[PDB]
Design a protein around this ligand. Structure first.
Ligand SMILES: NC(=O)c1ccc[n+]([C@@H]2O[C@H](COP(=O)(O)O)[C@@H](O)[C@H]2O)c1
Ligand SMILES: NC(=O)c1ccc[n+]([C@@H]2O[C@H](COP(=O)(O)O)[C@@H](O)[C@H]2O)c1
Ligand SMILES: [Mg+2]
Ligand SMILES: [Mg+2]
Ligand SMILES: [Mg+2]
Ligand SMILES: [Mg+2]
Lengths: 467, 467
């Protein structure tokens, strides 16, 4: 059983003794610190609110467990047993906190307030930043969703140029990252963030998370197809690669099937096995059931270009209405090795330069999609901007001399539309002047209850590309 | 609840139709592919065995749930209901799998077998690689534990050179990574891996994981100290930083206390506030209860060196028996911003060149320690090396033409010590010739039971530095 009293940074256990005496309010906010990378997708807070913060999260047993752990961990009694007991007794263990947030799926530039946190009881001034640690982990679904959407922008640009439309876009970047993330929980969170933008995934854990915490009208939010791995090819023995291919495509004769083709020599597999020995099993397939050839090694760009040149000389190629080469509809390629946002851009640009339509290719990405990301990418940060001490509110901030980029915002914050329709964050309570219309943040959590929520279908609509 | 039938890569759902007919055994192994590092710490498999693989993991409801999800996810009935129901009925839902592994905490060069997996019932040839995805996530605790031990080696070298001993080494690298990892589950796994090498942590989640899955004779495996954050300084107001510092060191007058000092001007704080205004509260403190000044911004090397120069001109400095400068015992520094293995090395080398002992400094590291790591760092990989088809064993492997570094090992594997005391992995069942002493792999899981377990104390002993 998760215990929120044990789900903070150790030093926060000692902070209730450090704030100014007679502090009744601590007010804090989360942002992606401003370096015009540009526009982030806000996603993932609703998971945290429901799984970890709502309802009766304090019990007498959890207080005693934490007391006993911290006594040994600090070799001292610093733990605030009385403060936690107050929440248990006064509010039946429900947190006296209010969180306001931008709607999930919203696409918003860096440097803006995304959510704010404050205590609703003066006795609980210390609780606001107790829960910093758990809320800051929202950096991860934000960053996965944002980086996935930035890859969708690249794919959309090159698909539109080379084909004239966006058909199939939502299946062009497939999540391969289940083995390459750091835990089962991370797999579900990260896969769900990718599914904000795309529909193809092998990280099954994302499906149940979406169903439980967000919801979709469709039975499931993402889809897959049968596909080989090296064990199912190499198990046949090195002299029997053709037999493995023949068996697999015949077992999956009326659905799309991906077949990894590089166990021994990708180029021989394409030109001689697929292109000659088994060609009669490929040209017979349906447009709804292509063979998808999967290289999985070598320089990603060089390998894709050579595979395409090989297949173009063994299969009938057409020229689409934009002038780009197109494999027949029963044959496609997926590159799933070494894919991240940089190599994805390299490959589609290299294909365009060689006059190959992006219709021909799809991508799989594991670590690059779900693991090779840190809180530094969008520079996600949670800071106190306002306190009330001795009944007087003061605007507070940090401004380190050697790094102006760690300067934080001052006072009570609100998010507004500008006259040109862009976003602005107002500081120092200036939203109250109503010169910029109403605050766009909404109360999503108050006093142990989730007060506003979004379906996964809503989030996908909010996160759409402009195109 | 967790459902192992939904905890695999989607394509593995389809692999039972792809292996050669008449296959009764699939045998697979895990390694860190050869060389770039040398030596890895094997850690974290026992967590996975106990949390996810042992006991009754198949039920009628879980089979039906997976059947329903996969029907929608694939738009097709491909799920192996018969094969999963076989495990349910014959084995009461216990997995007929045997896993053999090197003892946890063992320090092993790259390119060696670390564990193997095989099915114990011919009907379950498909189950070996079903569980690849969950087992390969062991890359994360292995990589955290290894990267943390490599930092410990750097610290030990420089501490020995500048002071003559290793006193305090185990508290020199403190885990700050709770907010910077991707999930609660990752936090506990990663923090527990760092504690293989060190004893200081703020990532509380690691403590409960170790207690539940490994065990220590001590009450807790890691420890912390009171410390400020920017909210507990800046809440006092920009003009009252000195009041915040004075309150905090007085509240924690008899334990070590870390006080972040860079809210507005780290160099003013050190020279004028600590070095003059509050100096009388510092020079009175015990050797067991120093003030630890914490910069948190700017260039990490330049900032540490300038802080040390400032403090050495305001406080009495000694020269130790190695010739290096030493602050008084009541005053220390912790650098917890921008710390990874590369900047840690930069800082201790820069200190040595300026004749400062590493006794003066400690480090905190969050993302660099627990999040900025991928499966590519040690190149962790799980592959099939042996199968039995029509009662004949065959040695199988991949060997892609464009990347010899993706070549996998052949046949039945074993791990041995060499005559010179190093390690060798024997292939093709050659361990059976018994020219090389006992196999170092031990059965840790068989038919749903954990058969061999290690305490956290044993793991720490196995992972000790040579020195
Ligand atoms: N359906 C699939 O083909 C599938 C699914 C999951 C992982 N994979 C593997 O994932 C690897 C890529 O992972 P990384 O992006 O983490 O390096 C590929 O080499 C690929 O073989 C493939
Ligand atoms: N006890 C502490 O001082 C403590 C604990 C946890 C995090 N932190 C913060 O962790 C940050 C470092 O995080 P990253 O290494 O992920 O960038 C520091 O800037 C530091 O303020 C400090
Ligand atoms: Mg692969
Ligand atoms: Mg790989
Ligand atoms: Mg900081
Ligand atoms: Mg930071």
């Amino acid at each position: 059983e998760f215990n929120i009293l044990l789900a903070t940074d150790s030093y926060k256990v000692t902070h209730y003794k450090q704030y100014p005496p007679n502090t009744s309010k601590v007010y804090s906010y989360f942002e992606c610190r401003e370096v015009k990378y540009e526009e982030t997708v806000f996603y993932g807070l609703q998971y945290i609110l429901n799984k970890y913060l709502k309802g009766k999260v304090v019990t007498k047993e959890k207080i005693q467990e934490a007391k006993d752990v911290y006594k040994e961990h600090f070799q001292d009694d610093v733990f605030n047993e009385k403060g936690w007991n107050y929440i248990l007794e006064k509010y039946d263990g429900h947190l006296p906190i209010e969180i306001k947030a931008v709607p999930e799926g919203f696409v918003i530039p860096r440097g803006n307030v995304l959510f704010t946190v404050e205590n609703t009881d003066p006795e609980c001034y210390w609780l606001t930043n107790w829960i910093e640690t758990i809320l800051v982990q929202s950096w991860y679904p934000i960053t996965v969703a944002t980086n996935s959407r930035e890859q969708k922008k690249i794919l959309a640009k090159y698909l539109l140029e080379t084909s004239g439309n966006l058909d199939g876009l939502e299946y062009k970047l497939h999540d391969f990252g289940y083995r390459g993330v750091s835990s089962q929980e991370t797999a579900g969170i990260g896969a769900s963030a990718h599914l904000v933008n795309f529909k193809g995934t092998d990280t099954v854990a994302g499906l149940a998370l979406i169903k439980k915490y967000y919801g979709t009208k469709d039975p499931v939010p993402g889809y897959s197809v049968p596909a080989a791995e090296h064990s199912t090819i190499t198990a046949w023995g090195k002299d029997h690669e053709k037999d493995a291919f023949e068996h697999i495509v015949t077992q999956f004769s009326s659905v799309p099937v991906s077949v990894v083709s590089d166990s021994y020599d990708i180029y021989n597999a394409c030109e001689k096995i697929w292109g000659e020995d088994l060609r009669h099993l490929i040209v017979s397939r349906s447009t709804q059931a292509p063979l998808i050839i999967r290289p999985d090694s070598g320089n990603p760009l060089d390998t894709v270009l050579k595979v395409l040149e090989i297949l173009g000389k063994k299969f009938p190629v057409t020229e689409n209405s934009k002038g780009y080469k197109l494999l027949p509809p029963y044959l496609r390629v997926i590159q799933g090795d070494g894919v991240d946002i940089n190599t994805l851009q390299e490959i589609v640009e290299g294909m365009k330069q060689k006059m190959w339509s992006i219709e021909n290719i799809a991508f799989g990405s594991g670590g690059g999609l779900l693991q090779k990301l840190t809180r530094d990418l969008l520079n996600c940060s949670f800071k106190c901007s306002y306190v009330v001490t001795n009944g007087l509110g003061i605007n507070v901030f940090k401004d380190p001399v050697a790094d102006p980029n760690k300067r934080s915002k001052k006072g009570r914050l609100s998010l507004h539309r500008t006259p040109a329709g862009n976003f602005v964050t107002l500081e120092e309570g200036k939203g109250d002047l109503e010169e910029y219309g109403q605050d766009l943040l909404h109360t999503v959590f108050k006093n142990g209850k989730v007060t506003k929520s979004y379906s996964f279908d809503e989030i996908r609509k909010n996160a759409q590309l402009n195109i």
